[PDB]
Nucleic acid binder design. Structure first.
Lengths: 114, 209, 122, 120, 56
RNA sequence: CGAUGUCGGCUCAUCACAUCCUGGGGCUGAAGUAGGUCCCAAGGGUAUGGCUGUUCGCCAUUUAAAGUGGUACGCGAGCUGGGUUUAGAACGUCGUGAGACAGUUCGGUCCCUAUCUGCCGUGGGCGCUGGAGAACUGAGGGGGGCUGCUCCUAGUACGAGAGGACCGGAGUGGACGCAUCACUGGUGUUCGGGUUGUCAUGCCAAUGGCACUGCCCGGUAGCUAAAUGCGGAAGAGAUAAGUGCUGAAAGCAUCUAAGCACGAAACUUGCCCCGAGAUGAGUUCUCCCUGACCCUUUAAGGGUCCUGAAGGAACGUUGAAGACGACGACGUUGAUAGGCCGGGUGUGUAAGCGCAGCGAUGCGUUGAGCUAACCGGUACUAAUGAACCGUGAGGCUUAACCU
RNA sequence: AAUUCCUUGUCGGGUAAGUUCCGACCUGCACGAAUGGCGUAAUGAUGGCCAGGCUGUCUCCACCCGAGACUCAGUGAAAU
RNA sequence: ACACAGGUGGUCAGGUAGAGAAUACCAAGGCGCUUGAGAGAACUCGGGUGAAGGAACUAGGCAAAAUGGUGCCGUAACUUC
């Protein structure tokens, strides 16, 4: 089959900013949150590589908020406007699941500058 | 009125705004080529043999080749005969496409389900397992006590037993169509339909009261 | 699974310090609870300024679970712990006067309007 | 189950299956013909051709491979230096296969694996 | 349990059709080989495609 | 009595009907909400924890109901052995005493290699009496059946207030079967990283084995679920007990005799599947076959010339086929499986060289390197030249057609 | 009470409830002082209850690697 | 009684890690277990991994699974100290 591979290419984005797990994305979002449409500024670090395409959940985690707060929006969805990607990380993993078994003050994500 | 034979190519989701995911099954339906129409100097009932396929020129056999020869030089692998109701068909007209669903978007689907070999005694028949310890051993997934003492004193029909399973016909009556494309041979339906990817099925416009 | 003998943390102010669930509620031969379910609960440790004691029996609403909230857009709204708010069976609503943190915005959607006015910023 | 795998179960532990292919390869590199059963031969073809391909790829870091296998002196002047050019002149293919008559003492189908450059 | 009576001589049915086998229809003749060979296969003197490919 | 396991559990179930729930009808000290309480109907439904082996009971708490009973108080060549129970101990009661005690408490090994019946799946042989390939009917056979919470109808009706309906819906949940693999989790011993100890490649490399898959973290493909979806309806026919209209034998009376108007989840239809071992072998289309003779008083054959297969079986390469049978895709009118060259997912910047540094170690070339199943190109490797099972238009009767 | 009909004495503790464990009271039908009365330390392949841990024991099972069962070959038993 | 997954008092005493005759990877030396060929089903069975709860199991914590070392700080009732 080919048409099942083309059906996703009319809802996926064709040119976008480049990002990887550990990057600061500064997502501007709508996410409903009331009856009239309004733009909010979401903070945190992206924990997604989104290579699987249309259904990639675009997971973001703010470790600077209390114990750490986590949310999803999807990579190709109508609830997100644009990402800045001005600041970018330098990590050695792509899933980052250790943030779900280690205390935040011992799991702060490394900058590893030389 | 009639039915179409297709090819189930997978499942996905197409969403709504701002959310709700709308899971959809993806089917390809190459236009059904037609082989025969009855009550036209052949048989006492109104019916069409819709056909899909062609087979291979050095593998096709004489009793099949000579059965399609009235309609052409390709053995269309099957007939799929449907009786006519609330409509008409003739021996001239375009090969039957998904334009059958251009305005009638509620359908019913027939096909074989769960083609998964033997499964297992508990994985098929949804039994309750025995104790894994507390002195119990050797029995855990065996079918159990198959009857009761003397008076009925026999094994019942309509009970649960092991064997070769699956690949038997199921009919689905509550389905809505999301999109069709006759130029790209596409059918998109809301939810799921019986059998794995590669399944042929039958899809029909709804006649349920 | 949140079911009989599941231990939950309270988001209720000056509330109980250790609490454990019994039965499940909401339907005949029902299986398991999650976000938006109300369950029957028992007190094991109350804290000295508690107005209940050990072996007192109440109800609580489940506001967070480690399994999260499903079906927004095909993804899942995730959380890390199982948490509840204890309810008053005689007067309805929470047993306290305020709630700890924003809890969950699912309480604003359709069914829990008398709770999100008591304290929650949602 | 085997519901995805295309390999063969052969006989005995997986650590022996892998070792027997590497032992038959450690003989084929110096005897250039091996006699065995059709299941053993069809899996072995996909173990010897990576080793004969490796003999063309004498580059940085890639030369680190297969050094811990067949650790004997009687092949070190043939592996890479000789086992490369004999097939780098052929631009594709390394092994010639044939399936042979069944064993009369048991029931296995036989096979013959030969190198495409063998001179007896 | 043991055989209480010797069966009617027909009851060996589907064992009797397997009691001695070739399991092939029907082996082929070759111009340079004495004993018959299997379809698409090598002879007892190493002939394949009418040419000798192995030695015994 | 030359043996027949008994109360309890787990698991697998079934019958009754004096009906607990559901569908209904009726009396009432039926105002309303309820209770008290009886009969039509057995299609469907009907309990968890603390103590106890508990049957039973005492309490705690759920629920559409927490109904009763049969079946050797169902199912130990079904598993278990908590209770009943010897062989050990000890307190009491009894006896001169050994010892006894259905006094009490504690403790106490459970054998198995399947004929015929029963039941699920699945072959060969034979039956359909000319053969081979596909599609289709219908003698019969099974499956299903709801239910909490709340508001609007309605705080209306009813009643001194409190309290609180028929009607007939609308939102939102539960249970149960069936379905997919889309989620999103689990699994993932043909892929990568982190790592301890020791052996190996002479030694340093970094590439391997063993140590629970040595330990840990991810993961493609495949699978799987604690995933996400739908439905038994409705529209009607006829009935139960029962309620009425008209009305009689019996000039009255009455729901029944004539007649017509209804009446439940039960009965019938509708709804889904199975069905030609259907000897009681139905139908429609395609492909294959229509010549003689010798020898013999012969539905018994033994030969010869003339002339025949449709398609299968075999061969494998293989499969999302499969216990074995049995079955599907394909093989030069050429992608069945592998091999090569690309694309992708996963893992995470390697190894050299270069540089900084006392060194461990790090940084640049480098989004590096490594790679499997995911899918695009390509016949690189293999499938080569014969036989076999299978003919001669298939006995007779009845009516009609054509000549 | 390893002694007692009524018994799950009975008040109270432990518990969502507790015939089970404890504190206590003493109608011990029929305890009791070297066939001793009764309690600690220390011990036990020792009795019972509560709580923290472990976790597919349980809730609801599913994949992953292997052995037998499955199909034969050679050799070929057992109770009935 | 078997060409039997069983038995048999003492003795010697390498390396790496180790307290060691524990334990593991190796050496020297020894051994490859005298059914062969295939398939990869129910059900049994040696094991690994598990969302998220958690003894809720059971007559009873019976098996699974965990605990587990070296050093310092710290350390209750009862006691013949």
């Amino acid at each position: 089959s080919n048409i099942i591979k083309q059906l996703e290419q009319e809802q996926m984005k064709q040119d976008v900013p480049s990002f990887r797990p550990g990057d600061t994305v500064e997502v501007k979002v709508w996410v409903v949150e009331g009856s009239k449409k309004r733009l909010q500024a979401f903070e945190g670090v992206v924990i997604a590589i989104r290579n699987r395409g249309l259904h990639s959940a675009f997971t973001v985690r703010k470790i600077s908020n209390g114990e750490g707060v986590e949310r999803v929006f999807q990579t190709h969805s109508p609830v997100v406007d644009s990402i800045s990607v001005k600041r970018r990380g330098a990590v050695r993993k792509a899933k980052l699941y250790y943030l779900r078994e280690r205390t935040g003050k011992a799991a702060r994500i490394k900058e590893r500058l030389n | 009125m009639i039915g179409l034979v297709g090819k189930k190519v997978g499942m996905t989701r197409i969403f709504t705004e701002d959310g709700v995911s709308i899971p959809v099954t993806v089917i390809e339906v190459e236009a059904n080529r037609v082989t025969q129409v009855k009550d036209l100097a052949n048989d006492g009932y109104r019916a069409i043999q819709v056909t899909t396929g062609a087979k291979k020129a050095n593998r096709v056999t004489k009793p099949e080749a000579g059965h399609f020869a009235k309609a052409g030089v390709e053995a269309g692998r099957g007939l799929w005969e449907f009786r006519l109701a609330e409509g008409e068909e003739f021996t001239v007209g375009q090969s039957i496409s998904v334009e059958l669903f251009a305005d009638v978007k509620k359908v019913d689907v027939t096909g074989t389900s769960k083609g998964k070999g033997f499964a297992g005694t508990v994985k098929r028949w949804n039994f309750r397992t025995q104790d894994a310890t507390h002195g119990n051993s050797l029995s855990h997934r065996v079918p159990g006590s198959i009857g009761q003492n003397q008076t009925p004193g026999k094994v019942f029909k309509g009970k649960k037993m092991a064997g070769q399973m699956g690949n038997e016909r199921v009919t689905v009556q509550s389905l809505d169509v999301v999109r069709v494309d006759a130029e790209r041979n596409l059918l998109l339906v809301k939810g799921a339909v019986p059998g794995a990817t590669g399944s042929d099925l039958i899809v029909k416009p709804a006649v349920k009261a | 699974m949140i079911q009989e003998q599941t231990m939950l943390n309270v988001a209720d102010n000056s509330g109980a310090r250790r609490v454990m669930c019994i039965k499940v509620l909401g339907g005949s031969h029902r299986r398991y609870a999650g976000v938006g379910d109300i369950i029957k609960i028992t007190i094991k440790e109350a804290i000295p300024r508690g107005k209940v004691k050990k072996g007192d029996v109440l109800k609580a609403v489940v506001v967070r679970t480690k399994k999260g909230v499903r079906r927004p857009d095909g993804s899942v709204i995730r959380f890390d712990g199982n948490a509840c708010v204890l309810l008053n069976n005689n007067s309805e609503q929470p047993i306290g006067t305020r709630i700890f943190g924003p809890v969950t915005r699912e309480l604003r959607s359709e069914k829990f309007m008398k709770i999100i006015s008591l304290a929650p910023e949602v | 189950m085997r519901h995805r795998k295309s390999g063969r179960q052969l006989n005995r532990n997986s650590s022996h299956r892998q070792a027997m292919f590497r032992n038959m390869a450690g003989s084929l590199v110096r005897h250039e013909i091996i006699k065995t059963t059709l299941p053993k031969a069809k899996e072995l073809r996909r173990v010897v051709e990576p080793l004969i391909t490796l003999a063309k790829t004498d580059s940085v870091a890639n030369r680190r491979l297969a050094f811990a296998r067949t650790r004997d002196n009687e092949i070190v002047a043939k592996l890479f230096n000789e086992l490369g050019p004999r097939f780098a002149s052929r631009a594709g293919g390394y092994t010639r296969i044939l399936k042979c008559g069944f064993r009369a003492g048991d029931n296995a189908p036989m096979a013959y694996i030969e190198l495409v450059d063998r001179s007896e | 349990a043991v055989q209480q009576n010797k069966p009617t001589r027909s009851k060996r049915g589907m064992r009797r059709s397997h009691d001695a086998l070739t399991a092939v229809t029907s082996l082929s003749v070759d111009k340079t080989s004495g004993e018959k060979h299997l379809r698409h296969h090598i002879t007892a003197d190493g002939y394949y495609r009418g040419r000798k490919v192995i030695a015994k």
